[PDB]
Amino acid sequence: TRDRNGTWEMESNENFEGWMKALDIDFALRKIAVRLTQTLVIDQDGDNFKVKCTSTFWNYDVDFTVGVEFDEYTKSLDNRHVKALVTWEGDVLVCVQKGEKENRGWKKWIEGDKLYLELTCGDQVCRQVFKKK
Ligand SMILES: *C/C=C(C)/C=C/C=C(C)/C=C/C1=C(C)CCCC1(C)C
């Protein structure tokens, strides 16, 4: 399915520290973030998405249209400008963030009841799994 709509509660988070370190997020901020429980809210309407990842201190929001490049400034993360592009590869939602870091982006799959998110930077992959609330 290409559906991603819903409220998604994190069940597992693998190598979040390694991925934050690959982005050069400062150590002190990584220590605050690393085991915060995350909720991911996705609103999807045709090509248009609004994605909100929320925690206690610390949010990450992005809105985009599938197939339309957009500038992203990761102000609450590593504070870089990337040219982002989200597309479908079959039923996989794929984002490439072109910029300083190589292999930077994310992918979302659904399998069973569950949303699988892989965040990449350099040689690091962070694997998260969410259940729909
Ligand atoms: C499709 C879903 C995506 C791309 C969600 C990405 C979520 C993040 C990059 C969240 C990052 C966060 C940190 C690096 C610090 C802790 C706060 C978070 C969880 C919002």
UniProtKB/Swiss-Prot annotation:
What name does this protein carry? Retinol-binding protein 2
Q: Please name the source species.
A: Homo sapiens (Human)
Q: Which family does it belong to?
A: Belongs to the calycin superfamily. Fatty-acid binding protein (FABP) family.
The domain comment in this protein's record states: Forms a beta-barrel structure that accommodates hydrophobic ligands in its interior.
- Give a Gene Ontology cellular component term annotated to this protein: cytosol
Subcellular location per UniProt equals: Cytoplasm
Offer one example of a GO biological process linked to this entry: epidermis development
What role does it play?
Answer: Intracellular transport of retinol.
Any one Pfam family match given in the protein's UniProt record, by short name: Lipocalin
